[PDB]
Design a protein around this ligand. Structure first.
Ligand SMILES: [Cl-]
Ligand SMILES: [Cl-]
Lengths: 123, 113
């Protein structure tokens, strides 16, 4: 949750108004960790910090994120922070489907976007 | 405010409560077409007073996010009512929803469509 706050700062710096979601996992409704918007692009973000790859994500967590994004009208992203690395943003298409769940390993991580690119995608 | 979340989802909005250095509303909602940034108030009776800072912060967030800024007000025995900021009565240094403003309030159905 310390890390969710750091990402908020980076999002605001990149031109997004962003909020952390109160009780993401503690609620009945699909929930991301952060929701952000800049008037054109809207983001539903699951926020993860790991000491090393790979990041594993359950099918359920990704399904929930995608369902929320569809209902809200936002793009679904996983934001992953590793030590000594800037935040990297993975559209859900970029997640590897494997063993009935999802993963970001060494073959996927380098393709993750920096926050500036997420904004520019619209154009 | 959790009752409000349920009302928003029932009306077809995906809505979250907001958990600070930056401007932020109480609830943000969207249905793909309309996005809402909502300050949530529950009161026993009118008027409701809102500070200029609170309304300014709500409008700034709404402008930055790409949402419509609303105050949602719940009174006992009444359905939730939604007020765009331009509905608010401007007093000397504050904003207000009194008996004359309250009738203008939208119900959730109208906000969506
Ligand atoms: Cl984490
Ligand atoms: Cl990097």
């Amino acid at each position: 949750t310390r890390f969710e706050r750091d990402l908020l700062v980076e999002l605001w710096k990149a031109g997004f108004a962003a909020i952390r979601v109160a009780g993401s996992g503690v609620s009945p409704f699909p929930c991301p960790d952060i929701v952000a918007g800049n008037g054109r692009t809207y983001l539903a973000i699951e926020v993860k910090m790991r000491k090393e790859l790979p990041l594993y994500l359950s099918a359920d967590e990704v399904e929930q994120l995608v369902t929320f994004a569809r209902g809200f009208g936002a793009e679904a992203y996983v934001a992953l922070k590793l030590p000594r690395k800037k935040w990297r943003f993975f559209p859900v298409q970029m997640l590897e489907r494997t063993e009935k769940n999802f993963k970001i390993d060494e073959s996927v991580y380098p393709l993750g976007l920096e926050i500036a690119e997420v904004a520019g995608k619209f154009f």
